[PDB]
Write a protein that binds this ligand. Structure first.
Ligand SMILES: O=C1O[C@H]([C@@H](O)CO)C(O)=C1O
Ligand SMILES: O=C1O[C@H]([C@@H](O)CO)C(O)=C1O
Ligand SMILES: O=C1O[C@H]([C@@H](O)CO)C(O)=C1O
Ligand SMILES: O=C1O[C@H]([C@@H](O)CO)C(O)=C1O
Ligand SMILES: O=C1O[C@H]([C@@H](O)CO)C(O)=C1O
Ligand code: NA
Ligand code: NA
Ligand code: NA
Ligand code: NA
Ligand code: NA
Ligand code: NA
Ligand code: NA
Ligand code: NA
Length: 207
């Protein structure tokens, strides 16, 4: 599957793509404002994520740090990124269908649109100004708006028992972005697409 990753932000981002225990395609790349990076994701990839990272520094070996979404210090990510991260999530070729969503379960750093470029389903979007509106106790100094699980590490926020409800904090993310997961047991906002669809992830879509 083809994913075109487009940075419409005014600022540089470092895109990342992983399934948790491996890179997808090269795993990461710099995108200056306006740049597009096209990757290939293997069919059948389960549990893939794409995200942006902000305020990164890398040396010539591709090691360094980002203020949001750092993945073990690597330019090419192999693992998931440090919150806060707005997440484009996908599982491809699962019994004939693809499943896409946007999540704020790991917080929010950059606004996002995640849409198919082929026919048969609709896209999803979280483009509200979550960072500017973020509750004081969730604000990350690095940039971004942390989820409550990251901040407080409770069973209720992290839904560790598989028993949890919405919270004051999850409802904030839900109010600003109804079409994204706000907590682990949120009513799903997953979209079912035809198997082997292709996609575009746009950072800062309203920019
Ligand atoms: O880091 C980058 O890589 C590409 C190009 O320079 C070679 O792939 C690009 O446009 C970036 O900002
Ligand atoms: O116009 C500009 O381009 C770069 C950056 O935004 C590219 O992403 C920068 O720092 C500017 O002031
Ligand atoms: O893969 C996972 O992603 C979400 C969350 O961590 C980010 O949305 C979750 O609950 C998983 O088990
Ligand atoms: O495995 C996942 O779990 C959550 C959600 O679907 C249920 O918590 C999510 O965002 C994932 O990628
Ligand atoms: O039937 C198919 O659709 C996709 C692609 O063509 C996008 O539509 C693909 O890889 C197929 O085999
Ligand atoms: Na891949
Ligand atoms: Na295939
Ligand atoms: Na992101
Ligand atoms: Na990183
Ligand atoms: Na507030
Ligand atoms: Na199909
Ligand atoms: Na298909
Ligand atoms: Na936007």
């Amino acid at each position: 599957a083809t994913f075109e990753i487009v940075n419409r932000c005014s600022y540089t981002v470092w895109a990342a793509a992983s399934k948790g225990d491996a890179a997808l395609d090269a795993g990461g790349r710099q995108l200056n404002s306006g740049e597009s990076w096209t990757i290939n994701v293997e069919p059948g990839t389960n549990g893939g994520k794409i995200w942006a990272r902000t305020d990164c520094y890398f040396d010539d070996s591709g090691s360094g740090i980002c203020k949001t979404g750092d993945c073990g210090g690597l330019l090419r990510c192999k693992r998931f990124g440090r919150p806060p991260t707005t997440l484009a999530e996908f599982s491809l070729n699962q019994y004939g269908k693809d499943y896409i969503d946007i999540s704020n379960i790991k917080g929010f750093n950059v606004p996002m649109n995640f849409s198919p470029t082929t026919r048969g389903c609709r896209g999803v979007r979280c483009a509200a100004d979550i960072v500017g509106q973020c509750p004081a106790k969730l604000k990350a100094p690095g940039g971004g708006c942390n989820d409550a699980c990251t901040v407080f590490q409770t069973s209720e926020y992290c839904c560790t028992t598989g028993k949890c409800g919405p919270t004051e904090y999850s409802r904030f993310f839900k109010r600003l972005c109804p079409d994204a997961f706000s907590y682990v047991l949120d009513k799903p906002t997953t979209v079912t697409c035809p198997g082997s669809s292709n996609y575009r992830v746009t950072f800062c879509p309203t920019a």
